[PDB]
Amino acid sequence: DVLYLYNWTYYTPTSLIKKFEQQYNVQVVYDDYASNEDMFAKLSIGASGYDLVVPSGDFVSIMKRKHLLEKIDLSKIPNVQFIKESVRARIAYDPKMEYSVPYYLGAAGIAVNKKAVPSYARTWSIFSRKDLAYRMSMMDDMREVMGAALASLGYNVNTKNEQELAQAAILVTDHWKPNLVKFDSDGYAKSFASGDFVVAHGFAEAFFAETPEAMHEHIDFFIPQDVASPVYVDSFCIPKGARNRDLAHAFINFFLEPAHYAEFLDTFGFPSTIHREAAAYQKKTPYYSEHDLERGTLKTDVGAAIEHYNAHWNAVRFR
Ligand SMILES: [Cl-]
Ligand SMILES: [Cl-]
Ligand SMILES: [Cl-]
Ligand SMILES: [Cl-]
Ligand SMILES: [Cl-]
């Protein structure tokens, strides 16, 4: 009678949770987390108490190899038929959805204050602009920042090549970092709203939630299209030891109902990247289109190649 949901703060719209609660006469314990590292920690060897968790594609692959996830019974999730074919092809960490079901696919991008920066190219190299120095931020995320640098240099955002990573590190350290106030994943949208940052790396839903609607026309948010910018996919997974698998499946099935998925997308101004029905049911014009995610590269599990990422990033981030 209770579903234990573990997800990013606000990521499951409470409005949808109430509906699932009213429909099934159940209650949802929704514990939030601020990162997949933190989520992972609760689900570490061996068993949290959760029925559902929402990891990104790299963390689905990591958690499969560490045997942290339970097989999903797709017969209990008929609405899995709404998952676009194009998405099915990209989810190589779990292509048959045996351990995961897609929740959302999007990408971080760049917001530019068009009144403060009238001329700019719509590219990552915007962070090398010395005329905007100390009025920009990039995200406090290693895979996003390294990924953007790798993308810009024509390298795979998931590369395992050591000289490509060093090259990316030099790009961030020597070309972008000197122009940044800081790396910031939580204050950038507010600082962008005040005018403190005039260009910032981040999520469209944050920039637009945080800036009054009156001032939206002055924002150009874009995911750079001239390179294979990093893209993410988040998924429902059932943690090892889940006590209520029946409600876990029922919730994934509920979330993927066209009107209920559309209500999810509309909450954040998301396009229907994964769902073949939901766009018809949406009330909100998306902040970016699904076609903006085509050229980009899905962030994946890099395996050991992580040690090189870590070593370069800790230097970028703490020096
Ligand atoms: Cl705990
Ligand atoms: Cl500063
Ligand atoms: Cl937000
Ligand atoms: Cl503004
Ligand atoms: Cl290294």
Side-chain angles (χ1 to χ4, degrees):
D1 304 297
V2 63
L3 178 76
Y4 277 64
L5 172 63
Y6 202 31
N7 192 8
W8 296 78
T9 325
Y10 318 126
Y11 205 21
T12 314
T14 49
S15 60
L16 282 169
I17 282 160
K18 322 245 101 327
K19 276 160 200 209
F20 180 80
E21 277 179 337
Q22 220 219 309
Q23 173 162 3
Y24 294 95
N25 274 355
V26 295
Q27 305 152 251
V28 189
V29 177
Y30 178 179
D31 296 328
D32 58 294
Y33 54 80
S35 89
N36 279 327
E37 278 304 332
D38 282 343
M39 171 276 293
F40 179 90
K42 217 135 159 197
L43 278 66
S44 302
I45 300 69
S48 66
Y50 301 97
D51 299 309
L52 279 175
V53 66
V54 180
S56 50
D58 50 328
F59 278 83
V60 174
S61 172
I62 290 158
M63 294 163 104
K64 268 173 81 164
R65 303 198 304 247
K66 285 211 168 209
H67 308 285
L68 261 35
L69 301 181
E70 297 195 348
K71 290 188 181 180
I72 295 178
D73 178 8
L74 295 177
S75 70
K76 288 184 170 174
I77 312 169
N79 293 332
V80 99
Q81 288 310 293
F82 295 134
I83 295 303
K84 281 178 179 180
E85 182 48 51
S86 51
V87 171
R88 301 188 139 113
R90 299 176 91 167
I91 58 157
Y93 54 83
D94 196 41
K96 304 188 174 178
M97 295 181 274
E98 179 169 41
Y99 287 93
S100 67
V101 175
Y103 186 106
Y104 181 66
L105 187 155
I110 305 163
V112 174
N113 178 335
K114 291 196 285 187
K115 71 193 145 173
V117 197
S119 183
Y120 54 96
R122 291 196 176 83
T123 67
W124 296 105
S125 285
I126 191 157
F127 295 108
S128 76
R129 286 193 55 174
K130 289 199 191 186
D131 68 316
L132 308 169
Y134 322 118
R135 297 195 290 157
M136 300 192 289
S137 69
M138 291 190 80
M139 287 202 286
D140 191 350
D141 185 85
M142 173 178 75
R143 301 292 318 271
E144 287 302 352
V145 179
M146 287 304 280
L150 285 162
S152 299
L153 296 159
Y155 300 144
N156 200 277
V157 317
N158 305 304
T159 200
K160 286 133 180 181
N161 182 300
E162 283 156 29
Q163 39 274 336
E164 289 176 353
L165 291 169
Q167 195 165 336
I170 290 164
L171 192 61
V172 184
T173 304
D174 286 343
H175 298 296
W176 297 348
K177 176 178 168 180
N179 300 314
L180 304 182
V181 173
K182 60 191 195 205
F183 295 103
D184 194 357
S185 284
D186 35 71
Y188 65 81
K190 201 168 107 131
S191 297
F192 184 89
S194 62
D196 279 5
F197 305 163
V198 296
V199 178
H201 185 202
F203 303 117
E205 68 273 15
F207 289 113
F208 288 100
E210 194 94 36
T211 294
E213 214 207 71
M215 289 314 178
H216 285 191
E217 62 182 50
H218 298 277
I219 308 168
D220 186 0
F221 174 87
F222 50 95
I223 301 145
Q225 297 292 302
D226 70 318
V227 296
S229 307
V231 174
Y232 68 79
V233 53
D234 289 325
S235 290
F236 290 107
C237 298
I238 292 171
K240 176 187 168 138
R243 302 169 188 106
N244 210 322
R245 287 173 53 83
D246 298 320
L247 270 184
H249 287 83
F251 187 87
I252 301 170
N253 197 55
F254 171 95
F255 193 81
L256 293 176
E257 209 68 69
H260 293 86
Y261 199 75
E263 172 181 328
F264 162 65
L265 299 169
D266 282 354
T267 292
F268 304 104
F270 289 161
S272 194
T273 50
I274 74 168
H275 199 285
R276 34 179 224 96
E277 297 299 290
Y281 288 80
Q282 286 187 257
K283 308 295 191 290
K284 191 168 174 54
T285 304
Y287 291 135
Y288 51 91
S289 83
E290 60 145 356
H291 305 289
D292 290 339
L293 294 138
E294 295 180 6
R295 294 181 166 198
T297 296
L298 189 70
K299 291 175 292 178
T300 65
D301 191 42
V302 295
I306 208 46
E307 271 51 279
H308 310 299
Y309 284 82
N310 280 6
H312 287 294
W313 176 252
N314 281 350
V316 169
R317 179 54 177 83
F318 299 116
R319 288 173 202 185

CSV table of all heavy atoms in Angstrom, one decimal, residues 14-43:
chain,number,residue,atom,x,y,z
A,14,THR,N,4.7,16.5,-8.0
A,14,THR,CA,3.9,16.1,-6.9
A,14,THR,C,2.4,15.9,-7.4
A,14,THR,O,1.7,15.1,-6.9
A,14,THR,CB,3.9,17.1,-5.8
A,14,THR,OG1,3.7,18.4,-6.3
A,14,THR,CG2,5.2,17.0,-5.0
A,15,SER,N,2.0,16.7,-8.4
A,15,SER,CA,0.7,16.6,-9.0
A,15,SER,C,0.4,15.2,-9.5
A,15,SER,O,-0.7,14.7,-9.4
A,15,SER,CB,0.5,17.7,-10.1
A,15,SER,OG,1.4,17.5,-11.1
A,16,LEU,N,1.4,14.6,-10.1
A,16,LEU,CA,1.3,13.3,-10.7
A,16,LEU,C,1.3,12.2,-9.5
A,16,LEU,O,0.6,11.2,-9.6
A,16,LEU,CB,2.4,13.0,-11.7
A,16,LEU,CG,2.2,13.6,-13.0
A,16,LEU,CD1,3.4,13.6,-13.9
A,16,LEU,CD2,1.0,13.0,-13.7
A,17,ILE,N,2.1,12.5,-8.5
A,17,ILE,CA,2.2,11.6,-7.3
A,17,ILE,C,0.8,11.5,-6.6
A,17,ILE,O,0.3,10.5,-6.3
A,17,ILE,CB,3.3,12.0,-6.3
A,17,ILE,CG1,4.6,11.5,-6.9
A,17,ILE,CG2,3.0,11.5,-4.9
A,17,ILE,CD1,5.8,12.2,-6.3
A,18,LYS,N,0.2,12.7,-6.4
A,18,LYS,CA,-1.2,12.8,-5.8
A,18,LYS,C,-2.2,11.9,-6.6
A,18,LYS,O,-3.0,11.3,-6.0
A,18,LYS,CB,-1.7,14.2,-5.7
A,18,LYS,CG,-0.7,15.3,-5.3
A,18,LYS,CD,-1.0,16.0,-4.0
A,18,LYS,CE,-0.1,15.5,-2.9
A,18,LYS,NZ,0.3,14.0,-3.0
A,19,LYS,N,-2.1,12.0,-7.9
A,19,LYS,CA,-3.0,11.3,-8.8
A,19,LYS,C,-2.8,9.8,-8.7
A,19,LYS,O,-3.8,9.1,-8.7
A,19,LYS,CB,-2.8,11.7,-10.2
A,19,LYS,CG,-3.6,13.0,-10.6
A,19,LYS,CD,-3.1,13.7,-11.8
A,19,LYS,CE,-3.6,15.2,-11.8
A,19,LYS,NZ,-3.7,15.8,-13.1
A,20,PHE,N,-1.6,9.3,-8.6
A,20,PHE,CA,-1.3,7.9,-8.5
A,20,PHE,C,-1.8,7.4,-7.1
A,20,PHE,O,-2.3,6.3,-7.0
A,20,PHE,CB,0.2,7.7,-8.6
A,20,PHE,CG,0.6,6.2,-8.4
A,20,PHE,CD1,0.5,5.3,-9.5
A,20,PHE,CD2,1.2,5.8,-7.2
A,20,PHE,CE1,0.9,4.0,-9.4
A,20,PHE,CE2,1.6,4.5,-7.1
A,20,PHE,CZ,1.5,3.6,-8.2
A,21,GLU,N,-1.6,8.3,-6.1
A,21,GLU,CA,-2.1,8.0,-4.8
A,21,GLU,C,-3.6,7.9,-4.7
A,21,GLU,O,-4.2,7.0,-4.1
A,21,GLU,CB,-1.6,9.1,-3.8
A,21,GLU,CG,-0.2,8.9,-3.3
A,21,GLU,CD,0.2,10.0,-2.4
A,21,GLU,OE1,-0.3,11.1,-2.4
A,21,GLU,OE2,1.2,9.8,-1.6
A,22,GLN,N,-4.3,8.9,-5.4
A,22,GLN,CA,-5.8,8.9,-5.4
A,22,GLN,C,-6.3,7.7,-6.2
A,22,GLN,O,-7.3,7.1,-5.8
A,22,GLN,CB,-6.3,10.2,-5.9
A,22,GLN,CG,-7.6,10.6,-5.1
A,22,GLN,CD,-8.7,11.2,-6.0
A,22,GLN,OE1,-8.4,12.2,-6.7
A,22,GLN,NE2,-9.9,10.7,-5.8
A,23,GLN,N,-5.7,7.4,-7.4
A,23,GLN,CA,-6.1,6.3,-8.3
A,23,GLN,C,-6.0,5.0,-7.6
A,23,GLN,O,-7.0,4.2,-7.6
A,23,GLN,CB,-5.4,6.4,-9.6
A,23,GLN,CG,-5.7,5.2,-10.5
A,23,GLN,CD,-5.3,5.4,-11.9
A,23,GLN,OE1,-4.7,6.4,-12.3
A,23,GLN,NE2,-5.6,4.4,-12.8
A,24,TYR,N,-4.9,4.7,-7.0
A,24,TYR,CA,-4.6,3.3,-6.5
A,24,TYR,C,-4.8,3.2,-4.9
A,24,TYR,O,-4.6,2.2,-4.4
A,24,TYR,CB,-3.2,2.9,-6.9
A,24,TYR,CG,-3.1,2.7,-8.3
A,24,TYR,CD1,-2.6,3.6,-9.2
A,24,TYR,CD2,-3.4,1.4,-8.9
A,24,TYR,CE1,-2.4,3.4,-10.5
A,24,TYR,CE2,-3.3,1.2,-10.3
A,24,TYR,CZ,-2.8,2.2,-11.1
A,24,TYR,OH,-2.7,2.0,-12.4
A,25,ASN,N,-5.3,4.3,-4.3
A,25,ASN,CA,-5.4,4.3,-2.8
A,25,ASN,C,-4.2,3.8,-2.1
A,25,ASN,O,-4.2,2.9,-1.3
A,25,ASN,CB,-6.7,3.5,-2.4
A,25,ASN,CG,-7.9,4.3,-2.4
A,25,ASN,OD1,-7.9,5.5,-2.7
A,25,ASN,ND2,-9.1,3.6,-2.2
A,26,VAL,N,-3.1,4.4,-2.5
A,26,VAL,CA,-1.8,4.1,-2.0
A,26,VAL,C,-1.1,5.4,-1.5
A,26,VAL,O,-1.7,6.5,-1.8
A,26,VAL,CB,-0.9,3.4,-3.0
A,26,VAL,CG1,-1.4,2.0,-3.4
A,26,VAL,CG2,-0.7,4.2,-4.3
A,27,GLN,N,0.0,5.4,-0.9
A,27,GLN,CA,0.8,6.6,-0.7
A,27,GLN,C,2.2,6.4,-1.2
A,27,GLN,O,2.8,5.3,-1.2
A,27,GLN,CB,0.8,6.9,0.8
A,27,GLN,CG,-0.6,7.1,1.4
A,27,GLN,CD,-0.6,6.7,2.9
A,27,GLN,OE1,-1.1,5.7,3.3
A,27,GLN,NE2,0.0,7.6,3.7
A,28,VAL,N,2.9,7.5,-1.5
A,28,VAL,CA,4.3,7.5,-2.0
A,28,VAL,C,5.2,8.1,-1.0
A,28,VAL,O,5.0,9.3,-0.7
A,28,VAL,CB,4.4,8.1,-3.5
A,28,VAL,CG1,5.8,7.9,-4.0
A,28,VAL,CG2,3.4,7.6,-4.4
A,29,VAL,N,6.2,7.4,-0.5
A,29,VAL,CA,7.3,8.0,0.2
A,29,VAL,C,8.3,8.4,-0.9
A,29,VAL,O,8.9,7.6,-1.6
A,29,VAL,CB,7.9,7.1,1.3
A,29,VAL,CG1,9.1,7.7,1.9
A,29,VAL,CG2,6.9,6.7,2.3
A,30,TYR,N,8.4,9.7,-1.1
A,30,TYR,CA,9.3,10.3,-2.2
A,30,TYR,C,10.5,10.9,-1.5
A,30,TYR,O,10.5,12.1,-1.0
A,30,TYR,CB,8.6,11.3,-3.0
A,30,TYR,CG,9.4,12.0,-4.1
A,30,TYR,CD1,8.7,12.9,-5.0
A,30,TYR,CD2,10.7,11.8,-4.3
A,30,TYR,CE1,9.4,13.6,-6.0
A,30,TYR,CE2,11.4,12.4,-5.4
A,30,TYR,CZ,10.7,13.3,-6.2
A,30,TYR,OH,11.4,14.0,-7.2
A,31,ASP,N,11.6,10.1,-1.4
A,31,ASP,CA,12.9,10.7,-0.8
A,31,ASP,C,13.7,11.2,-2.0
A,31,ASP,O,13.9,10.5,-3.0
A,31,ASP,CB,13.7,9.6,-0.1
A,31,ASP,CG,12.9,9.1,1.2
A,31,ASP,OD1,12.2,9.9,1.8
A,31,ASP,OD2,13.1,7.9,1.5
A,32,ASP,N,14.1,12.5,-1.9
A,32,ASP,CA,14.9,13.1,-3.0
A,32,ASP,C,16.4,13.0,-2.8
A,32,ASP,O,16.9,12.7,-1.7
A,32,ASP,CB,14.5,14.6,-3.2
A,32,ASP,CG,14.6,15.5,-2.0
A,32,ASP,OD1,13.8,15.2,-1.0
A,32,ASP,OD2,15.4,16.4,-2.1
A,33,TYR,N,17.1,13.2,-3.9
A,33,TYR,CA,18.6,13.2,-3.8
A,33,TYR,C,19.1,14.3,-4.8
A,33,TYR,O,18.4,14.6,-5.7
A,33,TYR,CB,19.2,11.8,-4.1
A,33,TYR,CG,18.8,11.1,-5.4
A,33,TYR,CD1,19.4,11.5,-6.6
A,33,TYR,CD2,17.9,10.1,-5.4
A,33,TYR,CE1,19.0,10.8,-7.8
A,33,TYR,CE2,17.5,9.4,-6.5
A,33,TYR,CZ,18.0,9.8,-7.8
A,33,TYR,OH,17.6,9.1,-8.9
A,34,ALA,N,20.3,14.8,-4.5
A,34,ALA,CA,20.8,15.9,-5.2
A,34,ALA,C,21.9,15.5,-6.3
A,34,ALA,O,22.4,16.3,-7.0
A,34,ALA,CB,21.4,16.9,-4.2
A,35,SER,N,22.2,14.2,-6.4
A,35,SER,CA,23.1,13.6,-7.4
A,35,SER,C,23.0,12.1,-7.5
A,35,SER,O,22.6,11.5,-6.5
A,35,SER,CB,24.6,14.0,-7.0
A,35,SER,OG,25.1,13.0,-6.2
A,36,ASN,N,23.4,11.6,-8.6
A,36,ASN,CA,23.4,10.1,-8.7
A,36,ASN,C,24.5,9.4,-7.9
A,36,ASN,O,24.4,8.3,-7.6
A,36,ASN,CB,23.6,9.7,-10.2
A,36,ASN,CG,22.2,9.7,-10.9
A,36,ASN,OD1,21.2,9.4,-10.3
A,36,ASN,ND2,22.2,10.1,-12.2
A,37,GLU,N,25.5,10.2,-7.5
A,37,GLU,CA,26.5,9.7,-6.5
A,37,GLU,C,25.8,9.4,-5.2
A,37,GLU,O,25.9,8.3,-4.7
A,37,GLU,CB,27.6,10.6,-6.3
A,37,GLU,CG,28.7,10.6,-7.3
A,37,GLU,CD,29.3,9.2,-7.5
A,37,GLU,OE1,29.3,8.4,-6.5
A,37,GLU,OE2,29.8,9.0,-8.6
A,38,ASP,N,25.0,10.3,-4.8
A,38,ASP,CA,24.2,10.2,-3.5
A,38,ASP,C,23.2,9.1,-3.5
A,38,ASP,O,23.1,8.3,-2.6
A,38,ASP,CB,23.5,11.5,-3.2
A,38,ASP,CG,24.4,12.6,-2.7
A,38,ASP,OD1,25.5,12.3,-2.2
A,38,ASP,OD2,24.0,13.8,-2.7
A,39,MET,N,22.4,9.0,-4.6
A,39,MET,CA,21.5,8.0,-4.9
A,39,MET,C,22.2,6.6,-4.8
A,39,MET,O,21.7,5.7,-4.1
A,39,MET,CB,20.9,8.1,-6.3
A,39,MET,CG,20.0,6.9,-6.7
A,39,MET,SD,21.0,5.5,-7.5
A,39,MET,CE,21.5,6.3,-9.0
A,40,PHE,N,23.3,6.6,-5.5
A,40,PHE,CA,24.1,5.3,-5.6
A,40,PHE,C,24.5,4.8,-4.3
A,40,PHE,O,24.3,3.6,-4.0
A,40,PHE,CB,25.3,5.5,-6.5
A,40,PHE,CG,26.1,4.3,-6.7
A,40,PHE,CD1,25.9,3.3,-7.7
A,40,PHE,CD2,27.2,4.0,-5.8
A,40,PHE,CE1,26.6,2.2,-7.8
A,40,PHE,CE2,27.9,2.8,-5.9
A,40,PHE,CZ,27.7,1.9,-6.9
A,41,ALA,N,24.9,5.8,-3.4
A,41,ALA,CA,25.3,5.5,-2.1
A,41,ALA,C,24.3,4.8,-1.2
A,41,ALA,O,24.6,3.9,-0.4
A,41,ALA,CB,25.8,6.8,-1.4
A,42,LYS,N,23.0,5.2,-1.4
A,42,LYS,CA,22.0,4.6,-0.6
A,42,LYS,C,21.7,3.2,-1.1
A,42,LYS,O,21.2,2.3,-0.3
A,42,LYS,CB,20.7,5.4,-0.6
A,42,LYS,CG,19.9,5.5,0.6
A,42,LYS,CD,19.5,6.9,1.0
A,42,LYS,CE,18.4,7.0,1.9
A,42,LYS,NZ,17.8,8.3,1.9
A,43,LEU,N,21.9,3.0,-2.4
A,43,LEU,CA,21.6,1.7,-3.1
A,43,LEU,C,22.9,0.8,-3.2
A,43,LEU,O,22.8,-0.3,-3.7
A,43,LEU,CB,21.0,1.9,-4.4
A,43,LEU,CG,19.5,2.2,-4.5
A,43,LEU,CD1,19.1,3.5,-3.8
A,43,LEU,CD2,19.0,2.2,-5.9
